[PDB]
């Protein structure tokens, strides 16, 4: 097994527009959505087939009840936040909780909040503390740090419970999550602006989205400016990316323990 992660996000919007829900919560195993809930449907639903087939209705029932409570607490927390900042109009409140089970078997845990898309409060499970960005965040921190039981509960959920759910879902989603689709790499050369030649190293059809791409001149790194293309979803469960240089050059690609060289 390579590096895998479990995350849950919560989005709260005060006074939303016509369509948009007041509350949304989505879960992810790596880049894959797994679960969904909002203040319109008011139901926790699967977003992956391997979740729908492996978790019995009792799971969806219990978590729907939990999410309805969380929805209400999020609406109250954003009202208090807006009041502290002396803010009117539409504002956002976000949370992200999660996991990582690393290749070496070690683990990571994170719990963070954002107000208007900016960092607000960051949990430190090692010192059992909240890191505050400003004085509003400092006021909230003090209230949260007074409840020692909740801090301890949060450390146990992050270190133990989250990892156990992650290991559970990785097993259900094994045919998707643990697969490898190797990349199709090509080099395209072109005389661009009258004097310069641009070289493009392009990869596609790969899964997982983690790919390492670089250009090397004579076996050593490129001191010149390398342009990088974003790792983009192709729409079929696979990804694409590129790297480019201007002018013995060679493209180097690393994906799932396989190194590829394309000499020009």
């Amino acid at each position: 097994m390579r590096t895998h992660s479990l995350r849950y996000f919560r989005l709260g919007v005060s006074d939303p527009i016509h369509g948009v829900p007041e509350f949304i919560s989505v879960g992810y195993v790596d880049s894959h959505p797994i679960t969904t809930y909002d203040s319109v449907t008011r139901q926790k639903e699967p977003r992956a087939p391997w979740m729908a087939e492996n978790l019995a209705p009792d799971h969806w029932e219990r978590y729907t009840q939990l999410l309805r409570g969380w929805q209400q607490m999020f609406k109250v927390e954003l009202k208090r936040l807006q009041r502290h900042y002396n803010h009117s109009g539409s504002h956002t409140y976000q949370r992200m909780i999660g996991c990582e089970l690393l290749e070496d078997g070690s683990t990571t845990g994170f719990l963070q909040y954002a107000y208007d898309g900016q960092d607000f409060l960051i949990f430190n499970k090692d010192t059992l503390s909240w890191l505050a960005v400003d004085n509003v965040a400092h006021t909230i921190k003090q209230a949260w740090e007074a409840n020692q039981h909740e801090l301890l509960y949060q450390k146990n959920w992050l270190e133990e419970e989250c990892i156990a759910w992650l290991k559970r879902f990785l097993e259900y989603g094994k045919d998707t999550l643990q697969r490898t689709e190797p990349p199709l790499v090509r080099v395209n050369r072109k005389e661009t602006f009258p004097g310069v030649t641009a070289l493009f190293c392009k990869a596609h059809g790969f899964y997982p989205p983690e790919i390492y791409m670089t250009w090397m001149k004579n076996g050593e790194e490129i001191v010149q400016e390398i342009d990088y293309g974003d790792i983009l979803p192709s729409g079929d469960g696979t990804y694409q990316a590129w790297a480019s240089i201007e002018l013995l050059y060679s493209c180097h690609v690393e994906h799932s323990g396989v190194h590829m060289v394309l000499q020009v």
């Epitope: 799971h59 219990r62 301890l152 959920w157 419970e161």
Partner: antibody
Framework: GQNIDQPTEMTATEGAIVQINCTYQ??????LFWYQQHAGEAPTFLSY??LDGLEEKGRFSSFLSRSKGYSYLLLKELQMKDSASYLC??????????WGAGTKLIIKP | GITQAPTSQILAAGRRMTLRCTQD?????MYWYRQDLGLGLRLIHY???????GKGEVPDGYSVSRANTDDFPLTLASAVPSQTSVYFC???????????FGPGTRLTVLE
């Protein structure tokens, strides 16, 4: 979860020490609670444990070992007033509080 | 903190009964348990916040509503002798925290 086990009854002498054991077999773990329920009254909160260790609150101490799925409530310098039922409750992965049948503690004067 | 009404009741089987539960702590989560000899506390129904209810381990023969944060009524639409028990109402601030129990209601259903 599925099972919380604590003895039905325990008898000890006044001024002595008693350790009330609780083993749990749950699907996930989000904390262990100990409550005291005097005959004919409501249960009242004694302690919460979620991480490994012993927590002292006067004559009462609660211990937890997550790897063993085991807790104990230790009562020192036993008084007649300590004659009550002691309930063990575990919060599983679905945030459902699972209650043990309770341990009736009898104190010999 | 929590009050329950009535605290004692004898009911003829087939009759309707409503156990009332009021809290003042503005706790979001509310619970109804039944306590019978040899068993623990068995959850009948729960409510995580105003406007939602869930079924517990023993929901049959009972119904609940949660229109407001403060109240959580338990209805027995047609009482049966097996509904003879001690009923406790409980509340918690959140879903991960400790429960505060109401005094209890001793209900006896007779043929």
């Amino acid at each position: 979860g599925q099972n919380i086990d604590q003895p039905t009854e325990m008898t000890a002498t006044e001024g002595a020490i008693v350790q009330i054991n609780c083993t749990y077999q749950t699907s996930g773990f989000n904390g262990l609670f100990w409550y005291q329920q005097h005959a004919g009254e409501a249960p009242t909160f004694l302690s919460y444990n979620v991480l490994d260790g012993l927590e002292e609150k006067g004559r009462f101490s609660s211990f937890l070992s997550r790897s063993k799925g085991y807790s104990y409530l230790l009562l020192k310098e036993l008084q007649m007033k300590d004659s009550a039922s002691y309930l063990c409750a575990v919060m599983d992965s679905n945030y459902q509080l699972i209650w043990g049948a309770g341990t009736k503690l009898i104190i010999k004067p | 903190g929590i009050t329950q009404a009535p605290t004692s009741q004898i009911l003829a089987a087939g009759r309707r009964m409503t156990l009332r539960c009021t809290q003042d702590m503005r706790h979001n989560a509310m619970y109804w348990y039944r306590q019978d000899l040899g068993l623990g506390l068995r959850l009948i129904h729960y409510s995580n916040t105003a406007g939602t209810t869930g079924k517990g381990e023993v929901p049959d023969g009972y119904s609940v509503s949660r229109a407001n944060t403060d109240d959580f009524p338990l209805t027995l639409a047609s009482a049966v002798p097996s509904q003879t028990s001690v009923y406790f109402c409980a509340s918690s601030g959140g879903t991960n925290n400790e429960q505060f129990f109401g005094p209890g209601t001793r209900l006896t259903v007779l043929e």
